C-alpha cells in the first residue's frame, strides 16, 4: 500500500539498526546523568501548546478527547512535555532530562523530508552558565563519536540575542524586523545593503550578514552603542567560548552565523545546528530556550536520519536443518537446543524450522549435522 508523503516503513535490518541506535544513544545519555522520561504521544493542547510558536501550533495534529470533548494534540515536539515534567518534578536546582520518542508533523520541513521522526534529545534546566551548553556539546559529540560514522558533522553556531538587542537599540518596527530576517534567510546582501542605508544603525545589521562569520573581530566592527550593550558583548563572548571548546576538545569544523534566526520566538540565546555531510536540513538542532523564570538549554535529532550513515556488523542468520533435527532422539534434541540457546545469547538469529521449506530471509549459515556433531556451515 501507498504511504503518505514523509511517511516510510523502517524495515528489517534498518529497523534493527534503528533499535540499536535508539537503545545505545539512550544508554549513553543516561550514563552522562540525564534522567530518561517517556511522555505520551497525546496530551491536552493546554499543556502541549502552552507558549508554543505559531509554527508548532500549525505542525501539531488536533484530535478530540471523547471522554471530555476537549482538544488534544499529537506531539510535534517533546520539549514542551519536558517543561511540564520539570515544572512538577524538577525543583529550583539543576535538572537533566533525556528522551527518545516518535513525533508527528502535519507538514514536512525539507524536500521529501519525514513527517514521522524518532526524536531523541537531552535538556538541562536550571543553569544560567555557558558551562551547560558546553556539557551538551560534550554529550552530543560523545554520542556522535560512538556511532563510528564516516559522515562528518559540521556545526553552525548562532546567537539570537545579538540581533534582538540590535533591533531594540535601533527601535525597529515589526515590519522592519521581518524584512531584515527575510533578507538574512535569503542571503540577499545587495537589497540588505539598501534597506540598511535607510535604517538607524543599519551599518550594524549589514555587518552581521557580511562579517558575522568572523566572530573574533565582530564586536570591534559594531557601533559604539552596540559595543556598550552588555547583552551583545556577553553573547559574542559565549560564541567565542563555544567555538574554542568545539575546536580544542573535539576538533570540530565550526562556522559562525549570527543571522541564523529561525525559531526566533522559542530560542533565547545561543543556538547550534549540526549538519551531516551536505544535507540541507540540520541533523541536530539545539540552543537556549525558556522553562515556562527557569533556564533551559537542549538539543534534539531524528534518529532515523542516522540510519543512512551507520552500519552494524552483518548478522548471523542460522537455520537448523529440519530433516536432521527430526531424525534425532530426545536427548540429542535437548543438547542441540542448549547449543541453540547459547548461540542466541551471543546474538545469533536461530530459526527452528516448522517445515522442510521454512527458510529465513538473508540466510547466512546452516546448523547442520556432520559426523555426530553440529556445526555452522556458510551457505
Amino acid at each position: 500500500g501507498m504511504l503518505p508523503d514523509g511517511v516510510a516503513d523502517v524495515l528489517f535490518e534498518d529497523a534493527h539498526k534503528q533499535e540499536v541506535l535508539r537503545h545505545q544513544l539512550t544508554q549513553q545519555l543516561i550514563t552522562h546523568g540525564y534522567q530518561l522520561v517517556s511522555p505520551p504521544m497525546i496530551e491536552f493542547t493546554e499543556s502541549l501548546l502552552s507558549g508554543a510558536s505559531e509554527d508548532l501550533k500549525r505542525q501539531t495534529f488536533k484530535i478530540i478527547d471523547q471522554l471530555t470533548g476537549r482538544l488534544m494534540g499529537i506531539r510535534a515536539d517533546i520539549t514542551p512535555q519536558i517543561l511540564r515534567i520539570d515544572a512538577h518534578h524538577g525543583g529550583d536546582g539543576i535538572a537533566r532530562y533525556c528522551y527518545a520518542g516518535d513525533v508527528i508533523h502535519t507538514l514536512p520541513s525539507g524536500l521529501f523530508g519525514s513527517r514521522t521522526p524518532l526524536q531523541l534529545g537531552a535538556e538541562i534546566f536550571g543553569c544560567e552558565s555557558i558551562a551547560a551548553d558546553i556539557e551538551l556539546i560534550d554529550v552530543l559529540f560523545s554520542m556522535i563519536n560512538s556511532l563510528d560514522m564516516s559522515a562528518v558533522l559540521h556545526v553552525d553556531l548562532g546567537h539570537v540575542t545579538i540581533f534582538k538587542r540590535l533591533a531594540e537599540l535601533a527601535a525597529l518596527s515589526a515590519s522592519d524586523t521581518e524584512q531584515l530576517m527575510q533578507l538574512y534567510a535569503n542571503k540577499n546582501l545587495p537589497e540588505l545593503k539598501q534597506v540598511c542605508q535607510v535604517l538607524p544603525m543599519g551599518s550594524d545589521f549589514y555587518t552581521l550578514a557580511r562579517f558575522g562569520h568572523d566572530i573574533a573581530n565582530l564586536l570591534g566592527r559594531l557601533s559604539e552603542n552596540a559595543q556598550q550593550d552588555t547583552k551583545i558583548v556577553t553573547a559574542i563572548d559565549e560564541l567565542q567560548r563555544l567555538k574554542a571548546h568545539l575546536q580544542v576538545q573535539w576538533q570540530c569544523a565550526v562556522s559562525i552565523d549570527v543571522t541564523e534566526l529561525s525559531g526566533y520566538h522559542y530560542h533565547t540565546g545561543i543556538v547550534f545546528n549540526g549538519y551531516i555531510n551536505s544535507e540541507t536540513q540540520p541533523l541536530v538542532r539545539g540552543g537556549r530556550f525558556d522553562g515556562m523564570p527557569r533556564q533551559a538549554t537542549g538539543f534534539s535529532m531524528d534518529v532515523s536520519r542516522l540510519l543512512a550513515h551507520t552500519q552494524l556488523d552483518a548478522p548471523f542468520i542460522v537455520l537448523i536443518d529440519y530433516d536432521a533435527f527430526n531424525n534425532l532422539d530426545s536427548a540429542q534434541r535437548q543438547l542441540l537446543l542448549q547449543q541453540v540457546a547459547s548461540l542466541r545469547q551471543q546474538g545469533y538469529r536461530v530459526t527452528m524450522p516448522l517445515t522442510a521449506e521454512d527458510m529465513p530471509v538473508g540466510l547466512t549459515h546452516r546448523l547442520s549435522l556432520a559426523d555426530n556433531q553440529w556445526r555452522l556451515h556458510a551457505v
Binding site: 525539507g110 535569503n186 542571503k187 540577499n188 546582501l189 540541507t280
Partner: protein, 208 residues
C-alpha cells in the same frame, strides 16, 4: 558535470537576461529557439544553461538539478520560495500581479469565483482583503475565463494592460509588483561559492 548549471525561463525573461549573462562572461553558443538541445554550453566552460518553462525553474533549482536560476517573483510566490535563496532582484521583466474582470461589469452578490494560474497568490490576496473566494486552477491563458462565465475575476501578470483591454477586460486591484529574481540552491551556495561569486558580482554591477 562539476561546474554551474543555470536554469532560465524561455521568452521575455530569456531576452532581458542575455545582457546580464553577456556582462558576466556567459554567452550561449547558439539560439535556443532554433535548437533541439535541452542542455546548452556557454562561452564559460564552467557554466551550462537549461531553458525551462517558467514554473519549472524553482523546481530544478530546489532539487539541485540546477545550481541557480532566473524566475519571476510571480512564479516564486505561487510555487513557494522556501528551499532556495532569493539572492538578487535583477529589476528585469517588471510587471504587476493584478486582479481583472469584464469591462464595466458589476460584482455579483453571490460568492466570487477566481480563475487563475496563481492559485496560492489568489487565496493569499483575497484572505488579506477579508473576502471569501472560490478558486479554479487554470494552466493556460486566463483572459477567456470571465468571458464564458468560468470565473468572475482572474489573477494574472499585467504590464501595459493591452492583453486585458484587447480581450474586453480591465485591471481591478493591484496585488503586488513583480520582477525577475536570481535563486540559488542552498547546497550550491556553500559548495560552489567560488564559481558563483564572480557571476553574482557581475549581475550586481550590471543592475547598479
Amino acid at each position: 558535470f562539476l561546474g554551474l548549471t543555470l536554469a532560465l525561463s524561455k521568452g521575455r525573461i530569456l531576452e532581458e537576461t542575455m545582457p546580464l549573462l553577456r556582462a558576466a562572461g556567459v554567452e550561449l553558443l547558439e539560439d535556443p529557439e532554433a535548437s533541439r538541445k535541452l542542455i546548452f554550453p556557454t562561452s564559460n566552460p564552467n557554466v551550462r544553461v537549461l531553458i525551462l518553462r517558467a514554473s519549472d525553474v524553482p523546481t530544478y533549482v530546489e532539487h539541485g538539478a540546477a545550481d541557480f536560476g532566473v524566475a519571476g517573483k510571480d512564479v516564486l510566490l505561487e510555487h513557494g520560495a522556501n528551499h532556495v535563496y532569493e539572492l538578487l532582484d535583477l529589476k528585469i521583466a517588471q510587471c504587476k500581479l493584478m486582479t481583472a474582470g469584464v469591462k464595466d461589469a458589476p460584482l455579483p452578490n453571490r460568492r466570487l469565483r477566481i480563475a487563475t494560474k496563481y492559485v496560492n497568490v489568489a487565496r493569499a490576496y483575497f484572505a488579506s482583503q477579508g473576502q471569501q473566494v472560490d478558486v479554479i486552477k487554470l494552466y493556460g491563458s486566463m483572459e477567456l475565463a470571465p468571458l464564458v462565465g468560468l470565473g468572475d475575476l482572474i489573477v494574472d501578470v499585467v504590464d501595459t494592460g493591452n492583453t486585458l483591454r484587447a480581450n474586453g477586460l480591465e485591471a481591478r486591484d493591484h496585488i503586488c509588483d513583480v520582477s525577475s529574481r536570481l535563486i540559488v540552491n542552498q547546497v550550491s551556495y556553500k559548495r560552489k561559492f567560488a564559481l558563483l561569486e564572480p557571476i553574482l558580482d557581475s549581475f550586481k554591477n550590471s543592475i547598479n
